[PDB]
């Protein structure tokens, strides 16, 4: 086996669906004990589905914006497992709003989940990784903010720029303690968030929006939750023991093309 | 004159001192009517010193984290000047804290000023730049977050990564309305913020810390408020009318050196 | 005056037309003594047109891929001027060819002009800049290679990646001697090269190709030779005395847009 | 098994030692049939060492700057194997020279191997990967040129900038034909090239130079040929089927540290 995560303990935020679910599945397939962290009531069934496929999956229903409850959850995971090796911060919200139409509710919702939620998760995990003398943190950014941007994404792009900068500073601070910190910057991925955005843009024909996005990618398809989980698994593994402080673009050359398609 | 800002109106946050003061001075020297926006009591003397050098300088003492008061201030500037051409977001705080020692007060202070303050400033200015059919926004990021990082800067680097991303999204959103938005990413610059950080590292001999920083820069000096103001003036000017959505590193090759 | 280049001496390669001509004009308007370097016999007329507008413009017809003729030309410029302050490497070729169809002649033509030409120009200039303890080098890269790429541009993108890397290493090497080195990475610019490419892609309606390119830029226009010259003038000036080792994208947010 | 390269054919340039040897070993451990391409007299023994560990390794002693001989070698590999899935371009030279001391021989040596050698390798492989309906190309760039640079590396950094740009253009051109192209940008790695540079800087005590470089890395060690091979294996595998056109920095945060 080139990848062996047996006896490693991972927490994945956003584990109930989308890329977090993909990351939890790949870590579990590699032999990790995985905890799905999600506010969604679907998270228990998500962990159940993985146990039925022979995987060591567990859940905690908790809101990552509640620092006290999240800290209590991670302390409990570390206590009952004896260690914490891997954190994937995949929980996020993708709300769009034109800059002049932004209200305090929208600003707060996107930044609390995307920024403070990743902050709270890292802050609860790092102490347990220091006890272990070993940790891997994989943050989810976006191409939106650090690389490219469209109109209508100022708060989301601000939130993912924050993750980009936070990732580099956390990597720098804990390199000497063998905690490696990296970000995945996904392009157009086939998730519930993307399907919802497609329905918002064209309620009559959401599939036609998905088809147009796929045609603008040089690889001619959206990324999958498996593609995202595969890169998170690589970064969590002994195959990536020298790779830290980097933001890796996973986009099928969507941001590479000089003219679109 | 290759640069002529005569008849243009500029708002500069952080205008009392440091790079904001440099930006306001260079815009004013190029002929702009400049307003220094700053919470510091030093802002009155800063505007007075520019008027004494023959420059068209004004101030509003206001906290950029107070969105209602900031909006009132910018609406008043636009009403009395008849236009708003240029916004420079230089106001910021440089507080360092080890990640595990961060408390809610530190997190909130740095993000409120560095992120929400730049947000509030852009949100109050953009309506006036749309009326003007023309606007230039220069945000101050840092090399810290987007390019490099040291231990003890998680909140600051998060705040400057936020500015990096926000800059690109605002540029994308308003390019069609001729509002150009760019960020300056300074390296080690000789400002009150840097002098305060030097005194924190070695209270007995702050100058020795400044000297060590200068020796680590390939150009062998810190940047100046003039260097920063010169780049802000370029970005605000007709010399930069096709340049938008970019984060320009102004660092004397500090981030370039390999070893 | 915020910019004063009065009696600084500048060499601009590719000075006969396109962005090189824009850079030479802006430096000369700021008061520089400018030499247009070009292989084209049109370079004499280009310098004449600037002198007729009251500018201090001169030409040398020389091939930048001939190291030994270019070195003789720059030595002559420095000897007759007493100094050399500014070098703009704007000469380039923009030939496209699908990777499997590349032949040695292609590969050589694009890399000799774009890479070895910039190499030869910097190598002949730097000693004269060191004599007066001051130099500014502005290299022309592209967004193509360092930032984005389309099919059919492997050799061009290779050449502009080379300029990107060379710019950073030359900046690092001479920072301590006050030679500042930066690159401009232009997007879609309105030059003779672009106009020729538009005519090639649609001889029936070249302007419609220019209009389609302009519509893909968030600012809704191509860049001009003036936009390019304006940034080179900034980088050559006392306004940019702390800025070195950087590659600046001048593209009206063409590479920023998530959807075109 | 998360990674299975069984029945895949890989060509690795620079396979005799250093990071090329690491890449060939990791691809072979994952089940690939690997051909070590190298001018070094060591290359036969390198392939023999892998066969002694039960791995499917072969060699061709050939100079990548000889386009006709390299093309003949790759044509022979594809004909005898029926396939070509993976190309790793690790062969390179690391010669340093101050800019004003560069001569035609130095310029030619570094650019012929680092640039034209990668070009010749890709040009010989791509036709076989199109027949295969599948290819993965991993080019070796450096942090030197695209990210950072020290004095004395103008030709090397030019060569690695060329690889950076060529990687992106080749990725763009072949994305639609399922050839994925990426670059690894290593930092300070423990290879014969690095050990040669260490011995050049201090012949009496090369290890002290290696120790100083390791101390400048936040992870406090040099990268290994295994670290490099592990990233090349990832990029060659089904785990990276949506990752193309990227230059990935593998450096233990060497380029990240501010001060
Ligand atoms: N989908 C894309 O194309 C795309 C592109 C760029 C980046 N991203 C980023 O990737 C990450 C994952 O996105 P996805 O598409 O899988 O999203 P998704 O909405 O499909 O899945 C998100 C998951 O996060 C959970 N979550 C949300 N808020 C939470 C909270 N407060 N507490 C706990 N769990 C919470 C949800 O319940 C859900 O299970 C996000 O950070 C997103 O911004 C998405
Ligand atoms: N000095 C450096 O080396 C350096 C390096 C990189 C980035 N930066 C950034 O550049 C910008 C300018 O920094 P500087 O060194 O000039 O800082 P400074 O502290 O010297 O000047 C900052 C100014 O902003 C004002 N300000 C702060 N909070 C404010 C608020 N809430 N409302 C109104 N005004 C407020 C201060 O009163 C002061 O006049 C900042 O965003 C900083 O984070 C500085
Ligand atoms: N036009 C664009 O959209 C665009 C965008 C990206 C980058 N660029 C780059 O910017 C630079 C300038 O481009 P331009 O559009 O002004 O080009 P152009 O072809 O319109 O003008 C180029 C000039 O270079 C000169 N030149 C060419 N080969 C020479 C040689 N061997 N010796 C001396 N002079 C020589 C020509 O004679 C001519 O005057 C080039 O490096 C180009 O590749 C162009
Ligand atoms: N070692 C570092 O720290 C470092 C850092 C960044 C980039 N790199 C790059 O990574 C790659 C691998 O470097 P390394 O340190 O493993 O090098 P090395 O010198 O240890 O190994 C290089 C191998 O390439 C072979 N090779 C060289 N020229 C050849 C030619 N003309 N034809 C065929 N084979 C040839 C050599 O014989 C040798 O086996 C190179 O492209 C190098 O420039 C190295
Ligand atoms: Na694009
Ligand atoms: Na550095």
Angstrom distance (rounded) from CA C163 to CA D77: 35
C-beta B135 within 6 A of ligand 2: no
Angstrom distance (rounded) from CA D131 to CA A167: 41
DSSP state of B152: T
- Report yes or no: A21 and A49 within 8 Å, Cβ to Cβ: no
Angstrom distance (rounded) from CA A125 to CA A139: 13
Resolution expressed in Å: 1.8
Closest to D216 measured CA to CA, from D178, D153, D173, D259: D259
Partners for B (CB, 8 Å, 3+ pairs)? A, C, D
Angstrom distance (rounded) from CA B209 to CA B54: 36
Query: Atom 34, ligand 1: which residue's CA is nearest?
Result: A38
Angstrom distance (rounded) from CA B80 to CA A86: 57
Please tell me the distance in Å from A100's CA to the nearest CA on chain D: 35
The total of other beta-carbon atoms located within 10 Å of residue A255's CB is 20
Give the number of the atom of ligand 3 that is nearest the alpha carbon of residue C144: 6
Angstrom distance (rounded) from CA B37 to CA B65: 12
Angstrom distance (rounded) from CA B159 to CA C103: 50
* 3-state SS, one letter per residue, for chain A: CCCCCCCCEEEEECCCCHHHHHHHHHHHHCCCEEEEEECCCCHHHHHHHHHHCCCCEEEEECCCCCHHHHHHHHHHHHHHHCCCCEEEECCCCCCCCCHHHCCHHHHHHHHHHHHHHHHHHHHHHHHHHHHHCCEEEEEECCCECCCEECCCCHHHHHHHHHHHHHHHHHHHHHHHHCEEEEEEEECCECCHHHHHHHHHHCCCCHHHHHHHHHHHCCCCCCECHHHHHHHHHHHHCHHHCCCCCCEEEECCCCCCECCCC
Residue B241, φ and ψ in degrees, nearest 5: -70, -10
Contacts of B68 in chain A (CB under 8 A): none
Residue C1, CA distances (Å) to B4, C57, C239 in order: 9, 21, 11
- DSSP characters for D167-225? HHHHHHHHGGGTEEEEEEEE-SB-SHHHHHHHHHH-TT-HHHHHHHHHHTSTTSS-B-H
CA A115, chain centre distance (Å) = 12
C-beta C196 within 6 A of ligand 3: no
Contacts of A144 in chain C (CB under 8 A): 258
Strand A9-13 and strand A86-89: the pairing is: parallel
The pick from A12, A14, A118 for probing ligand 1's pocket by mutation, whose C-beta has the most ligand atoms within 8 angstroms, reads: A14
Rounded to the nearest 10 degrees, how much is the dihedral formed by the CA atoms of A165, A168, A170, A174? Answer: -170
Any idea which residue has 């843009």 for tokens? A201
Token pair of D153 as six digits = 């590396």
Minimum-distance ligand to the CA of C20? 3
Any idea which residue has 């809101």 for tokens? A63
Q: At what angle do helices A192-201 and A206-216 cross, to 10 degrees?
A: 110
Enumerate chain D positions whose Cβ falls within 8 A of a Cβ in C: 98-100, 102, 107, 115, 119, 122-123, 126-127, 144-146, 148-154, 156-166, 168-174, 245
**Domain span at residue C160?**
1-260
C-beta A140 within 6 A of ligand 1: yes
Angstrom distance (rounded) from CA A167 to CA A175: 12
Say whether C200 sits in a helix, a strand or coil.
helix
Name A184's bridge partners. A140, A248
The pick from A124, A158, A188, A193 for probing ligand 1's pocket by mutation, whose C-beta has the most ligand atoms within 8 angstroms, reads: A193
Closest to B144 measured CA to CA, from B16, B7, B259, B251: B251
Say whether B125 sits in a helix, a strand or coil.
helix
- Report yes or no: B77 and B9 within 8 Å, Cβ to Cβ: yes
Name D139's bridge partners. D89, D183
- Report yes or no: D11 and D124 within 8 Å, Cβ to Cβ: no
Angstrom distance (rounded) from CA A92 to CA A140: 8
Closest to B136 measured CA to CA, from B7, B1, B10: B10
Enumerate chain A positions whose Cβ falls within 8 A of a Cβ in D: 1-3, 26, 29-30, 168, 171-172, 175-176, 178, 218-221, 223-224, 227, 230-231, 233-234, 238-246, 248-253, 255-258
Residue A88, φ and ψ in degrees, nearest 5: -115, 120
Name A88's bridge partners. A12, A138
- Report yes or no: C42 and C17 within 8 Å, Cβ to Cβ: yes
- Report yes or no: D229 and D10 within 8 Å, Cβ to Cβ: no
Angstrom distance (rounded) from CA A65 to CA A14: 12
Angstrom distance (rounded) from CA B203 to CA B219: 26
Burial state string for A3-14 with b = 16 or more CB within 10 A and e = fewer than 16: bebeebbbbbbb
Find the helix or strand (DSSP H, E) in which B248 lies: strand B247-250
CATH of the domain at C39: 3.40.50.720
- DSSP characters for C90-129? -------B-GGG--HHHHHHHHIIIIIHHHHHHHHHHHHH
Domain count, chain B: 1
Q: Which residues of C are known catalytic residues?
A: 156
The total of other beta-carbon atoms located within 10 Å of residue C76's CB is 13
- DSSP characters for D74-87? HHHHHHHHS---EE
Q: Give me ligand 6 centre to Cα D240, in Å.
A: 29
Q: What method did the depositors use to determine the structure?
A: X-ray
Exposed, middle or buried: residue B80 (CB in 10 Å: 0-12, 13-18, 19+)? exposed
Token pair of A26 as six digits = 């790949």
């Amino acid at each position: 086996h080139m990848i062996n995560m047996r006896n490693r303990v991972a927490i994945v935020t956003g584990g109930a669906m989308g890329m977090g679910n993909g990351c939890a599945r790949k870590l579990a397939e590699a032999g990790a004990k995985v905890y799905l962290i999600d506010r969604s009531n679907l998270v228990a069934a998500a962990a159940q589905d993985m146990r039925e496929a022979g995987l060591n999956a567990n859940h905690v229903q908790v809101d990552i914006t509640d620092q006290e409850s999240l800290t209590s959850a991670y302390d409990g995971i570390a206590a009952e497992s004896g260690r914490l090796d891997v954190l994937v911060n995949a929980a996020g919200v993708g709300d769009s709003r034109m800059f002049l139409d932004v209200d305090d509710a929208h600003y707060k919702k996107v930044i609390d989940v995307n920024v403070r939620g990743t902050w709270n998760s890292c802050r609860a995990a790092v102490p347990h990784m220091l006890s272990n003398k070993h940790g891997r943190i994989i943050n989810f950014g976006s191409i939106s903010g650090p690389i490219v941007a469209d109109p209508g994404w100022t708060v989301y792009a601000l939130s993912k720029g924050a993750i980009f900068g936070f990732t580099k500073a956390l990597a720098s601070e804990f390199a000497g303690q063998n905690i490696l910190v990296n970000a995945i910057l996904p392009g157009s991925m086939d998730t519930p968030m993307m399907r919802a955005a497609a329905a918002d843009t064209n309620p009559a024909d959401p599939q036609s929006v998905i088809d147009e996005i796929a045609a603008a990618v040089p690889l001619k398809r959206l990324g999958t939750i498996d593609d995202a989980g595969n890169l998170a698994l690589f970064l969590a593994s002994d195959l990536a023991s020298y790779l830290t402080g980097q933001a890796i673009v996973l986009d099928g050359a969507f941001t590479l093309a000089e003219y679109q398609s």
